Amino acid sequence: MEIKRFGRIREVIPLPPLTEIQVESYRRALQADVPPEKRENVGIQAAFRETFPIEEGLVLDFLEYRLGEPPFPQDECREKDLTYQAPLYARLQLIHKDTGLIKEDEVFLGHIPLMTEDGSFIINGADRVIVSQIHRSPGVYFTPDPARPGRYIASIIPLPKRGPWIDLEVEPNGVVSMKVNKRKFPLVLLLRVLGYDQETLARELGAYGELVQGLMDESVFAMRPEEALIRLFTLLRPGDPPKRDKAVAYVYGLIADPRRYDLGEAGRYKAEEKLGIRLSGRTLARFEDGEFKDEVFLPTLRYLFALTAGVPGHEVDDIDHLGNRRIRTVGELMTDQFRVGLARLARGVRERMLMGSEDSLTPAKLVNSRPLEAAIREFFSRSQLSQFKDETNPLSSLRHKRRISALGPGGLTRERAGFDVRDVHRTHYGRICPVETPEGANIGLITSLAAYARVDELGFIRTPYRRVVGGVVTDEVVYMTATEEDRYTIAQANTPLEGNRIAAERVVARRKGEPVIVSPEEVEFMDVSPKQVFSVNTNLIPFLEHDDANRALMGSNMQTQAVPLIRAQAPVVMTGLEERVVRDSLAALYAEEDGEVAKVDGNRIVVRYEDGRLVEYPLRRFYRSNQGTALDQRPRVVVGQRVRKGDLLADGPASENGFLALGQNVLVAIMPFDGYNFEDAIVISEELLKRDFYTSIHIERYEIEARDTKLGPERITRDIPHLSEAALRDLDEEGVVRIGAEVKPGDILVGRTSFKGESEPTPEERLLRSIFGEKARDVKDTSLRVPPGEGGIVVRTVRLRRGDPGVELKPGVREVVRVYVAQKRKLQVGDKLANRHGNKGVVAKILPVEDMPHLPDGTPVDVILNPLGVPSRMNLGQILETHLGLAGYFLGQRYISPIFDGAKEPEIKELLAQAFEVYFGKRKGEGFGVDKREVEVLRRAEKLGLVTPGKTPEEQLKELFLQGKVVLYDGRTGEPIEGPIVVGQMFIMKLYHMVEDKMHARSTGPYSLITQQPLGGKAQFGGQRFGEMEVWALEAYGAAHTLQEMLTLKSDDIEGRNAAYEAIIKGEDVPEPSVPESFRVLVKELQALALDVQTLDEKDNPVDIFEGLASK
């Protein structure tokens, strides 16, 4: 159908590669395509360069490394639960200084996980994403002392875990103190160690007002750098014998050692820019010609004194400014863990160099790779920033890759995160979305990269601006940091232009975030697009300018929770980003070059390109994502079709002809309905179910192991004791359910028998056995069954057996069986629906079609939304959408309405007039006049001031239609709703929060080891937690017996719960509870602390709650 697009703002540049923040970072860290000798001293190369040479054979040096090819492809890694990784080899050489002997070898170091094409990893079979971390950039900062107004603190910050934070302060007594590792000492001493004399310090710092006198200490200048050095070593290391070389080693390792102290390149740059100096390396000082040499200290002190005095050109630093906060991407983080592992490896190396034969040492003998592999594995498996990939839909993955976290290792510990870190800073503009952040405790701490934003090589976030010269806007685009941006007057992207010239004499601009009205002469730069302000998710909300930000946050976040439907549609009203999202998420298949489609199949598309080569594209079909949603590609071309470069070949999940399809376009009415849409609840039509709207495919994975035991081996088999043919019906010969079988709760998926624990049959068992004369079998039923509330159709089985090719399981495991079960989920009561404007609700009622409100032409609406959900939410976007939807419904067209560049009311009115002619002219042509009920509604509408009195019925109905309102008949009575109702098409998504996955109940079930209280969680068939507050509720009701029951029979009273169950199945009332087991646990644990806790009666005589069982 035709797509009309609104807006006049012409985007000069397209969005950058949306996953480049991952891909380019990791590529930079690995340098795999770079021949060894051409590699830069960055990433893992830099890690190697920091670790080696290893001295005190006497020397082990690093030459180069190489990465081999992955031993297994990605899909295979997903199957066998393997990590997708490449072998890492390092070329090392061992040299004995005296002998001159040189032994060289390439040593295997283990594997390193590889990033897939889409920016993610495969770790032990599961897709993971390394989330970027925001932190304070290294450098030299000056901040106001919160205690002493007029005084300031200098802070020298290096990279995380690459040196201590050093503080310089002017003490109340006038002396300038330095704090390192929580040790306050006079800076004069260190200055002396660096080799400064009173003369130099006087001529350098004398200008400031007497501050320099707090720096003057005769007892410090009366001693040479060595004595000062040892003095400092005593001041920093109490108890440690003040030997010379130990002092030198410690101070060098604290301030000068590049293998231990490291400002980033960013920290170095920032220090240089702030202090107006130049650094040789990235440390605070050097060790040159036997002595220490200053680099940063004197300039820092200079600046501190200058700022304290009031000398112009010196200012404090806003630490939340995005010129002072940077991003650590996957490459950097991984490189850090790699560096740690390498350090451990080096310690191991020196350790081995001390031992063993000293003449027969090879690099292979010295290097144990285990700690490195361990550090890497730990990073990719159990790091905070290494997260289970969200791939509910492609947009989920895309967004997950663009997330920024202030938490994590070296990051902010929560609850120590005040309003400042969580605030939207002015410099977030164009860099970090002001909308997309979590609700609740993570708010402001997890954020999202703005659509046009790019992290630069130093880690600072940059946003694009257009150059403006003499009121003329060039196509030259410059990416700036916030620091750079603060220098210019930057016009808004919606500034009126004739050609490339600014057409208004008053233009809206920013100067350091401050909105200001300026002349075109003053304009230096201009925004590229409104798009650049917001994340990808927020950029998908049409009419965003009409929604309050709090609900925009919700619609934005909820798009990622949308489930791929079997009949998914792109929205009737789009923002124009829906294609780039599909393309960049690598969901869909596109033509590599121009060519002709040779073969089209559900499984594969074969294309013949212009080169004459036949390229075959296999199609991923009914694959299971991390969240169990269906991943499949449908061919969208036919045999013999002529395709150009970049043309669509196959639609992925949530894709409709290359357009992002997160849900369904449905006809909605905005009205109350008998309380069924009370408080955000939603009413829907059964028609939606009838035509499989909001139907989604979900795949669950079940797994079972047969292992070796001390009592005999478990085995997968069909020969399960005491089961009928009815229960074994769908099991194959080997004891595994067949492909295509429908399984329900209780049904066996995989048969398994386990040898019984050494049974001492109770006399009852012996007598019963005698009565029935049947030998008790050696093995028992331990089969994998469908859990309660689950099931569906078996679609795949995987069997891995020990002693078979390519197969080696964990020790003791004989075999592993996996069964995949697919279900087709229809929308049901309790399922969560949402639109892009933050309107969300669960389906409360599914009405038969004859009960739905309907148009005069007999067309029933699909969804009934409550108007009460609008005023206090202030998300009018959804209304406008609906209006446009109405037009689109009758014109058979879709729209692209860009944010802040979207369709305006008048244009929508025009479209609604056009649509009205189709909606009514058809009627008048078919030979029908206006209806009586319509006349009644028109009378009411005249009373409501909605239509002008005097006009004909058609003119008034047209007025209403232009207001987006129509006459609606109650399906139950055939009488019209007394007022005209807003009706139109709306894009609504079904979210992952389905009631099928949430409903859970328990009578009795498994209990905990120590506490003997019910386990938690649906998977463990757990019980609900009756917490402190629920207890308080019962107490406040005075419901003493209910409460005691919760405390005892219902949880952790063993005799009590047993007797209660037996009494209930006998039809007797439940007995009086006794002592909860966790109180006995408490008593014993207090005894273990050597405390004697005694329960006494009223006569102060001990009462034994252990019933003699614990008293000798």
Next chain:
Amino acid sequence: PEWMILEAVPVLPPDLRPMVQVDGGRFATSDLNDLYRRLINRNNRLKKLLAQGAPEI
């Protein structure tokens, strides 16, 4: 007052610091067992060191 000093350290019942076999046949155990083992090792070594007339340091 002297009871604030320990001569005999109590030992919690084993079921409150279990050594249990999990699904796959592997073992899981409480930290209290490692703390207790540290204690017992150091105590026993102390008794042996006293028995063999070790120096003061």
Next chain:
DNA sequence: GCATCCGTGAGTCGAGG
């Protein structure tokens, strides 16, 4: 009689993994 260092709290449930 008054600044300094230390130890301790910082919502709930539920879900995933």
Next chain:
DNA sequence: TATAATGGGAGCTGTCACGGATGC
């Protein structure tokens, strides 16, 4: 069971309010 060997090596730290010994 015997060449001689003799003092470790971790360490990024963006909150807050109170009771306390203290200890300036």
Next chain:
RNA sequence: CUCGA
């Protein structure tokens, strides 16, 4: 940890 209320 991430998600939900």
